[PDB]
DNA sequence: TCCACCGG
DNA sequence: CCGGTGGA
């Protein structure tokens, strides 16, 4: 149950067939960003964060 | 609340300071995988998925 | 004050003039790895870790 | 045990879930900068330092 | 006054009109690498080292 | 051994942990530049030249 | 800042 | 096929 401008942008991403991680949605709520511009920039930043987090290589001492 | 061999692998990622997105944990529980080997393969596959997903490039009608 | 093979690899890095972040050194002690191979792989993972971390873009809400 | 603005900025990075390597902290105590604006710029510069350092490729004479 | 394979590769570099910084030449003499392959490999690494190092950004406390 | 301003700017680069190639130091001394502003501009210019040089790509009759 | 090209 | 680097 989200803000209108939050909904605007999220569907933009749906339109590009991109699932947005749910950690990003959670982070998005606790911010009440006010333009669509800010939402898009916030989300874009978070996608980078998790592109990078997911690339992190796991050391294996077991394997 | 989770399976012993699941908690084993998640703590590997902690030790390596890696955040696992929560969508992955979600999908992980609805699988009851049996060994640590399997759990780890699954998680890895999912990190690739999301690395790719967070990489996908948005088409903007605005910016 | 460290294991001899640890030292062995840390000096390779020094010969190539690459500073190792000290967090890597921390994590490295907590693992008593046994071959020089293992130490190097471990260290190399950790470099990617922090190449990536340091690449994370900060969200500017105040600039 | 640090300056107020130092603390202001480091929690920025914490609210964005970004680890600051501890060599950066070291290097930051050593300058008593006086606005957040300078702290932030200083830290960003050091993140680039280490993104780049960590990217340096090691020459292997052994493997 | 250098090794014959060393001379061999540097000349390659000349034909492509490429200046090798002289710190590389230094680091090169302290390694007596044996094949041309290893020379080229070492030099190539050292090129990346200084491409990166020269990229690092300066923090300016006065300008 | 060098002019005080030369020295002032060189320590800027150290407090940023940046090695200056020694070909830069060389060219630097044969110019006696006067303000620190002039010195830094020079070094920077020179850092670009060599970022660029060290990037130029080798044509290999090896490979 | 975004787009295209080359390398692993 | 994906990731990184360089050029417009």
Query: In chain F, where are the structural domains located?
Result: 1-63
Rounded CA gap, F51 and E49, in Å?
10
The answer to whether the Cβ–Cβ distance between C16 and D51 falls below 8 Å is no
Output the CATH code of domain D1-63: 1.10.8.600
User: How many residue contacts between A and B have a Cβ separation below 8 Å?
Assistant: 67
Q: What is the resolution of this structure in A?
A: 2.9
Rounded CA gap, B48 and A60, in Å?
17
CA A30 to chain centroid:
13
Q: Does C49 touch chain B (CB under 8 A)?
A: yes
The answer to whether the Cβ–Cβ distance between E45 and C16 falls below 8 Å is yes
In angstroms, what separates the C-alpha of E60 from chain D's closest C-alpha? 9
Rounded CA gap, C36 and C8, in Å?
7
- Cβ-Cβ contacts under 8 Å for F47 (sequence gap 6 or more): E54, E55, F20, F24
Q: Does F63 touch chain E (CB under 8 A)?
A: no
Rounded CA gap, E52 and E56, in Å?
7
CB A9 within 8 A of CB A43: yes
Handedness of CA A52, A53, A54, A55 (dihedral sign): positive
CA atoms within 13 A on the CB side of E7: 4
């Amino acid at each position: 149950n989200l803000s209108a401008c939050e909904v605007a942008v999220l569907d933009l991403y749906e339109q590009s067939n991109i699932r947005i991680p749910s950690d990003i949605i959670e982070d998005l709520v606790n911010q009440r960003l006010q333009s669509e511009q800010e939402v898009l920039n916030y989300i874009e930043t978070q996608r980078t964060y998790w592109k990078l987090e997911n690339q992190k290589k796991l050391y294996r001492g077991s394997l």
